[PDB]
């Protein structure tokens, strides 16, 4: 279909059942439905750990190069996946969130140590 404005975007297509998500790396349009038409499937992502405890992220890296070479954009969660993989640098906000967490957890030891001291 011809959309009135948009660009090829590499996104995650949400599959799976209720309380059982499973994502599909797909090269689609910036205006197509999330689970609608896509140009090419560039892998998958199991967001739940398997029997061996890992997250299974297949990536058709060869084709990802071609689609990015044609102007393919990337969604926020998709960028972060390529970071954790090592194909792209780590996402900036990813780091800032870890810091915020560690600064929250700094406060936490101050309060939790007190609890153990009392009882």
């Amino acid at each position: 279909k011809a959309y009135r404005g948009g660009h090829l975007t590499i996104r995650l297509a949400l599959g799976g059942c209720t309380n059982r998500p499973f994502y599909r790396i797909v090269a689609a349009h910036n205006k197509c439905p999330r689970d609608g038409r896509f140009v090419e499937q560039l892998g998958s992502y199991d967001p739940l750990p398997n029997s061996h405890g890992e997250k299974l992220v297949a990536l058709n890296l060869d084709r990802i190069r071609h689609w990015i070479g044609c102007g393919a954009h990337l969604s926020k969660p998709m960028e972060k996946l390529l970071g954790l993989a090592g194909f792209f640098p780590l996402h900036p906000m990813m780091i800032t969130n870890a810091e915020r967490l560690r600064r929250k957890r700094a406060r936490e030891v101050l309060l939790a140590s007190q609890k153990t001291d009392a009882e």
């Binding site: 059942c17 059982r20 499937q41 299974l56 058709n60």
Partner: protein, 168 residues
């Protein structure tokens, strides 16, 4: 029974046994054969048996046939570049004609093998989705993953009704 003489010619298996797949250059093939005359026996057998096989593997090439227009049976091919290729086929069996045109205007085995490889790449064994296009649909069809809540109900922990009862 099936109608007609030699009913095998009207079966897909017979139609898929053609070994002449013209190059992309061939556009029009004309067959000027004779209906009588012992010399043209091979020519008419080719039209009876093989033209069905040729047109099948080559659905876009215009095959045209003419009876008793010239004293001699002959083929002619019109290529896209504008070259035309008279193949005289008098006193030549239908199987010989079948191999002659394969030699001069048929794709080699290398070209066909290459095309077959393209189909292999279209169906990537890893791509998950409808079995009309893929092998597996979900990733819960892979051994040793998280199964689908349908067959085996997942632990209440994983279900968003009892972990929300722990949230609240």
């Amino acid at each position: 029974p099936m109608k007609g003489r030699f009913p095998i010619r009207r079966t897909l298996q017979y139609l898929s046994q053609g070994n002449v797949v013209f190059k992309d250059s061939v556009k029009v093939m004309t067959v000027n054969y004779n209906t009588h005359g012992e010399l043209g026996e091979g020519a008419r057998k080719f039209v009876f048996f093989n033209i069905p096989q040729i047109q099948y593997k080559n659905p876009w090439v215009q095959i045209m046939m003419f009876k008793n227009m010239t004293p001699s049976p002959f083929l002619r091919f019109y290529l896209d570049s504008g070259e035309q290729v008279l193949v005289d086929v008098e006193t030549k069996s239908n199987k010989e004609i079948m191999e002659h045109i394969r030699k001069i205007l048929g794709k080699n085995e290398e070209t066909l093998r290459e095309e077959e490889e393209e189909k292999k790449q279209l169906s990537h064994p890893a791509n998950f989705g409808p079995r009309k296009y893929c092998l597996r649909e979900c990733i819960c069809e892979v051994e040793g993953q998280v199964p689908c809540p349908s067959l085996v109900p997942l632990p209440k922990e994983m279900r968003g009704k009892y972990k929300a009862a722990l949230k609240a």
